[PDB]
C-alpha cells in the first residue's frame, strides 16, 4: 500500500492518492549516513495544484515536478514550506525557477536564511501566534505552537478532512521524536493538543516521515515526546 524506503530509491518520487484531489508525495533522501522517506502534500485547486513541502533536494524536487506532470497533468502554481529544514525548503530554487510561487512564514524565512538554506519567496502573515489559522487556496494553514521546530506549520484540507502534520506529527511506529536539535519538547505536547482541539473531524493524519493513519497519530506523538523528555 503506502510506499516505504525499500521501495523508493533516492531521486525517485512516488505519489499516493489520499482523497479526491489530495495526494501525498514520498521521496527518499540520505542524511548523515541514513536513508529516510519523507512526505509532503499536493492539493487540487480547480485546474491548478498547491504543493506543500519540497521533496528534499533540487534533484528530488525536479523529479517531483516531473512525476506530478505525468500522474496528474496539472500545473503546480504555489508551494508552502512548513518549516525551515531542508526536507521542507531544499528545492525551493527549482520550484521558483519553474514558475511556482513559493511561500513560508516570516519566521521560517528568517530561520532558513540564518541556516544557509533556500528561502521561499513570499511571506505568509497571520501565523505568528499559537492557534492562528489562515486560508490559503484549498487549505487552511495552522500554527499550533513550537514542536519539532518553533516555526512548524500544519495543513488541513477541509474538503477531505485530511490533516498534514509535517514533522510536528510522528508516525505510529515511531518510538522517539527523532531529530530534536531545534525542537521544543516542553511545548510540543501542548501544540499537539491544540491540533487535536482544532481539527477533531480529521480522518487522515499524515506525518512528515512515514505512514499516514488516523487521529491517533496526534496522541501518539504527544506520548512519545513526553516519554522522550522523561
Ligand atoms: Zn525538521
Ligand atoms: Zn524532517
For residue 214, how far is its CA from the centre of ligand 1 (angstroms)? 22
Q: How many domains, the chain?
A: 1
For residue 21, how far is its CA from the centre of ligand 2 (angstroms)? 24
User: Which residues are the active-site residues?
Assistant: 83, 85, 87, 148, 179
The string of DSSP codes covering 161-203 is TEEEEETTS--TT--S----TT--TTTHHHHHHHHHHH-TT--
How far apart CA 36 and CA 28 sit, in angstroms, is 5
Q: Which ligand is closest to the CA of 56, given by its number? A: 2
For residue 187, how far is its CA from the centre of ligand 1 (angstroms)? 16
For residue 12, how far is its CA from the centre of ligand 1 (angstroms)? 21
The Cα-based distances of 56 to 30, 84, 85, 128, 193 in angstroms read: 10, 12, 9, 25, 28
Spatial CA neighbour of 56 closest among 16, 26, 34: 26
List helix spans (H) across the chain. 58-71, 86-89, 92-97, 106-115, 188-198, 216-229
In angstroms and rounded to an integer, the radius of gyration of the C-alpha atoms of the chain is 16
How far apart CA 159 and CA 63 sit, in angstroms, is 28
The domain in which residue 133 lies consists of: 1-230
Report yes or no: 127 and 105 within 8 Å, Cβ to Cβ.
Answer: yes
Q: Which ligand is closest to the CA of 54, given by its number? A: 2
C-alpha cell at 59: 534533484
How far apart CA 63 and CA 178 sit, in angstroms, is 26
Q: Which ligand is closest to the CA of 111, given by its number? A: 1
Report yes or no: 14 and 25 within 8 Å, Cβ to Cβ.
Answer: yes
Order across the sheet with 122-123: list the strands.
Answer: 13-19, 22-31, 34-45, 48-52, 76-80, 101-104, 122-123
For residue 210, how far is its CA from the centre of ligand 2 (angstroms)? 10
- Binding-site residue positions for Zn(2+): 83, 85, 87, 148, 167, 209
Residues near ion ligand 2 (Cβ under 5 Å): 87, 167, 208
Angle among Cα 122, 94, 212 to the nearest 5 degrees reads: 80
The Cα-based distances of 160 to 23, 45, 58, 64, 91 in angstroms read: 11, 13, 30, 23, 27
C-alpha cell at 214: 488516523
CATH code: domain of residue 151: 3.60.15.10
How far apart CA 90 and CA 222 sit, in angstroms, is 27
Distance of CA 75 to the CA centre of its chain: 20
How far apart CA 199 and CA 208 sit, in angstroms, is 18
Annotated resolution, angstroms: 1.7
For residue 170, how far is its CA from the centre of ligand 2 (angstroms)? 10
Q: Which ligand is closest to the CA of 148, given by its number? A: 1
C-alpha cell at 13: 518520487
Amino acid at each position: 500500500e503506502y510506499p516505504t524506503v525499500n521501495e523508493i530509491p533516492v531521486g525517485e518520487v512516488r505519489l499516493y492518492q489520499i482523497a479526491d484531489g489530495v495526494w501525498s508525495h514520498i521521496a527518499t533522501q540520505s542524511f548523515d549516513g541514513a536513508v529516510y522517506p519523507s512526505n509532503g502534500l499536493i492539493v487540487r485547486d480547480g485546474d491548478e495544484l498547491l504543493l506543500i513541502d519540497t521533496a528534499w533536494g533540487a534533484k528530488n524536487t525536479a523529479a517531483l515536478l516531473a512525476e506530478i506532470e505525468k500522474q496528474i497533468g496539472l500545473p503546480v502554481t504555489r508551494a508552502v514550506s512548513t518549516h525551515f529544514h531542508d526536507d521542507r525548503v531544499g528545492g525551493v530554487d527549482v520550484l521558483r525557477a519553474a514558475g511556482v510561487a513559493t511561500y513560508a512564514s516570516p519566521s521560517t524565512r528568517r530561520l532558513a536564511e540564518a541556516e544557509g538554506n533556500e528561502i521561499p519567496t513570499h511571506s505568509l502573515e497571520g501565523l505568528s501566534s499559537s492557534g492562528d489559522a489562515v486560508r490559503f487556496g484549498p487549505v487552511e494553514l495552522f500554527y499550533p505552537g513550537a514542536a519539532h521546530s518553533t516555526d512548524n506549520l500544519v495543513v488541513y484540507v477541509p474538503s477531505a478532512n485530511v490533516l498534514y502534520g509535517g514533522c510536528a506529527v510522528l508516525e505510529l511506529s515511531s518510538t522517539s521524536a527523532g531529530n530534536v536539535a531545534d525542537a521544543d519538547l516542553a511545548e510540543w505536547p501542548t501544540s499537539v493538543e491544540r491540533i487535536q482541539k482544532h481539527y477533531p473531524e480529521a480522518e487522515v493524519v499524515i506525518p512528515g516521515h512515514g505512514l499516514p493513519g488516523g487521529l491517533d497519530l496526534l496522541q501518539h506523538t504527544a506520548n512519545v515526546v513526553k516519554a522522550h523528555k522523561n
